[PDB]
Amino acid sequence: SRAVYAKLWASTAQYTQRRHYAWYQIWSRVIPWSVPWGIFAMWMVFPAMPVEYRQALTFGIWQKPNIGTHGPDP
């Protein structure tokens, strides 16, 4: 019947929308890889920043190294 043939033709009318739904599915699996790569980036540029900023991103945990040199002058 022509009615049946019409519904079969229309079954694939929303190709473009289904490709967009594919985009979402794949990008949701891939986007978490930004965290490992992000930690390493900050890890690399941390020593090139000022001392004042290095103590802020760590909540006062980080401090200058104490190796026993360059102490105050009497």
Binding site: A3, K7, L8, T12, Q14
Partner: peptide, 28 residues
């Protein structure tokens, strides 16, 4: 003794109304 066949006549129907009877079908 052949069986007695019932008649089913041809009828013209509105296409849009017959589409309300097609089973649901999804490909996507």
């Amino acid at each position: 003794p052949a069986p007695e066949y019932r008649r089913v006549p041809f009828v013209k129907e509105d296409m849009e109304k017959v589409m309300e009877e097609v089973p649901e079908f999804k490909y996507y």
